[PDB]
Amino acid sequence: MKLQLALDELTLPEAMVFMDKVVDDVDIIEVGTPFLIREGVNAIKAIKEKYPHKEVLADAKIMDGGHFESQLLFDAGADYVTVLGVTDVLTIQSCIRAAKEAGKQVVVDMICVDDLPARVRLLEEAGADMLAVHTGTDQQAAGRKPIDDLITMLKVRRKARIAVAGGISSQTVKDYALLGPDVVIVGSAITHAADPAGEARKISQVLLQHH
Q: How many other C-beta atoms lie within 10 A of the C-beta of residue 113?
A: 21
Whether the CB-CB separation of 5 and 20 falls below 8 Å is answered with: no
Query: Nearest 5°: phi and psi at 104?
Result: -115, -155
Q: Please, what is the minimum distance in Å from the beta carbon of residue 209 to a second copy? A: 30
- When binding is defined by CB under 8 A, the residue of 26, 74, 87, 206 that contacts a second copy is 87
- Residue 1 burial (10 A CB sphere; 0-12, 13-18, 19+): buried
Q: Collect all residues with Cβ–Cβ distance below 8 Å to 42 and sequence separation of at least 6.
A: 12
Residue 117, CA distances (Å) to 62, 78, 161, 178 in order: 21, 29, 15, 21
- Binding mask 120-159 vs a second copy (x if CB under 8 A, - otherwise)? ----------------xxxx-xx-----------------
Q: Please, what is the minimum distance in Å from the beta carbon of residue 68 to a second copy? A: 6
Whether the CB-CB separation of 159 and 192 falls below 8 Å is answered with: no
Q: Please, what is the minimum distance in Å from the beta carbon of residue 174 to a second copy? A: 25
Q: Please, what is the minimum distance in Å from the beta carbon of residue 22 to a second copy? A: 21
DSSP 3-state of 26: coil
Question: Which of these ranges, 26-34, 123-131, 149-157, 202-210, lies near a second copy under the rule CB under 8 A?
Answer: 26-34
Closer residue to a second copy in complex, CB, 68/148: 68
User: CA nearest 153: which of 183, 173, 126?
Assistant: 183
| Secondary structure, 3-state, 112-142 | CCCCHHHHHHHHHHHCCCEEEEECCHHHHHC
Closer residue to a second copy in complex, CB, 137/172: 137
Q: Is 38 in the site for a second copy (CB under 8 A)?
A: yes
- Which residues from 163-182 bind a second copy, rule CB under 8 A? none
Closer residue to a second copy in complex, CB, 9/182: 9
Question: Using CB under 8 A as the criterion, which residues of the chain lie in contact with a second copy when the complex forms?
Answer: 8-9, 32-34, 36-43, 60-61, 63-66, 68-69, 72-73, 84, 86-88, 90-91, 94, 111-112, 114, 136-139, 141-142
